[PDB]
Design goal:
Chains A, B: Its EC number is 3.5.2.6. Helices cover 41% and strands 19% of the residues of chain A. The first copy, chain A, is of the alpha+beta class. In chain A, strand 7 (210-216) and strand 8 form a beta hairpin. The complex binds chloride ion (4 copies) and sodium ion (NA) (30 copies).
């Protein structure tokens, strides 16, 4: 049962030198599991999901096609930051569709796409408020990728509880937030994600559908990796779904271990729910 | 003349809120210009040139083909760092040639490729020593990309004077360091660079050959961008060449201005040498 699954996860965590938050919520059925859920975990890129929700809601409500294009200045494409968009368009100064920018920001975790979209939607506060008004408490959106890059502690201002995340994922998956077509688009984009293949997906059967968004910090001079995260919705063999969010925070472990913590926890949940 | 060109550059710098180092050295002819050259400027990615020299020298001396392959672990491909290699191979755990890795590291400034190559060649000290033994003083190579990312000041341990850079570029261009074939390869790789198209290249005639390597820091909480750099060898219309290195350091200016400082300085030099 759920209590025994929870105990297994807690036992697994006993020798990991990290603070690990876990939440799970069934979509169709009533399953719920939380571990270490009352802490505030740094989100890193996982908040590009929240951002995409706010952007697609604005495009919906204002009747703006996702095929309309922003002018992306070269200055919008900062160097020495993770950015597949910048490598694809190294001169910048070009027109890119909201669709193209959202796909890169979500599926490929583009840091420059993220900030382009924050500027479009009206800033971090707009997104913070948007999420809060969906009725999901315990999420804080305060800093852009550029801002996070300026100073180590700024990432902690973009925080969440793990149960907030899965509450939000469930509202999403049930298409309670967006238009049908914007929902379909963001869901496809989340399944198309290419980052974190050894996180939630890592130990699940080949071809399992995992609609997800990763997040990753750097490491400080004390050996601490603030955030190694993955959040998403997984399709079970009988077509039902569960939302899961894992935050491996403030870790002294190497990256292979941090990813494996996510993969193993997810595999434990999968095995329980398929049984 | 050179003195008047120097005075023009110094006048140009008077209203820029940055500390800007410049050096120029003719390759075939005896031209020399230095501005603010006695400071120690953070290199950032420009030291991937030095790294490539050390790597290609090792491959030469040990008789290892550039087509031989390293196993690149997924852990070698860190997240949330600039890395076209990681976006191309998001699962990692694959065999990649030295050639492929060097091209990505130099032409596309890959941060993970850089560290893969530092590990191959035997670490930062090996590269530091290699450069020092070419007879070029005033270069310090101390920290990998991973190390720089851990703490703001670590980038300053990877420092250079601008005149050291052009001395090294000239030894290179005259094929005094490597085998003919490794020289040809690295030169092609430097012309193929796609980063910094609005730096040294920015205001030169379309199609000008510029074999170069950029470097870029992030910005801190005080608004300072430690490094915005570009170094290379430029072909004049009569087929002769000059080496140039520009380091825009500790800048309070926005990125468009920092890039423009490089472009304008280079254009001033170009205009003088073509006349
Ligand atoms: Cl592409
Ligand atoms: Cl929705
Ligand atoms: Cl490619
Ligand atoms: Cl050479
Ligand atoms: Na369910
Ligand atoms: Na439920
Ligand atoms: Na609990
Ligand atoms: Na909670
Ligand atoms: Na376009
Ligand atoms: Na994309
Ligand atoms: Na950015
Ligand atoms: Na909230
Ligand atoms: Na931060
Ligand atoms: Na909560
Ligand atoms: Na995926
Ligand atoms: Na994936
Ligand atoms: Na995953
Ligand atoms: Na720890
Ligand atoms: Na760590
Ligand atoms: Na010359
Ligand atoms: Na000279
Ligand atoms: Na001088
Ligand atoms: Na000097
Ligand atoms: Na290969
Ligand atoms: Na490449
Ligand atoms: Na790296
Ligand atoms: Na030296
Ligand atoms: Na640094
Ligand atoms: Na020197
Ligand atoms: Na180039
Ligand atoms: Na270029
Ligand atoms: Na350039
Ligand atoms: Na300054
Ligand atoms: Na600045």
């Amino acid at each position: 049962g759920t209590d025994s699954l929870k105990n297994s996860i807690e036992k697994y965590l006993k020798d990991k030198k990290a603070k690990v938050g876990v939440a799970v919520l069934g979509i169709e059925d009533n399953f719920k599991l939380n571990v270490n859920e009352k802490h505030h975990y740094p989100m890193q890129s996982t908040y590009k999901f929240h951002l995409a929700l706010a952007v697609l809601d604005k495009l919906d409500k204002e009747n703006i096609s996702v095929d309309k294009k922003l002018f992306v200045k070269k200055s919008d494409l900062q160097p020495n930051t993770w950015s597949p968009l910048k490598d694809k368009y190294p001169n910048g100064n070009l027109e890119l569709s909201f669709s193209e920018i959202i796909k890169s920001t979500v599926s490929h975790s583009d840091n420059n796409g993220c900030d382009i979209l924050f500027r479009f939607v009206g800033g971090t506060n707009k997104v913070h408020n948007f999420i809060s008004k969906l009725g999901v408490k315990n999420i804080s959106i305060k800093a852009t990728e550029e801002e996070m890059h300026k100073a180590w502690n700024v990432q902690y201002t973009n925080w969440t509880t793990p149960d907030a995340t899965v509450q939000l994922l469930k509202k999403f998956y049930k298409n309670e937030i967006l238009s049908k077509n914007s929902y379909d688009f963001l869901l496809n984009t989340m399944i198309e994600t290419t980052t974190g293949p050894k996180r939630l997906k890592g130990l699940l059967p080949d071809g399992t559908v995992v609609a997800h968004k990763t997040g990753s910090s750097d490491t400080n001079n004390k050996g601490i990796t603030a955030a190694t995260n993955d959040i998403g919705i997984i399709t079970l063999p009988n077509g039902k779904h569960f939302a899961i969010a894992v935050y491996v925070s403030d870790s002294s472990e190497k990256s292979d271990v941090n990813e494996k913590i996510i993969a193993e926890i997810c595999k434990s949940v999968w095995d329980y729910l398929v049984k």
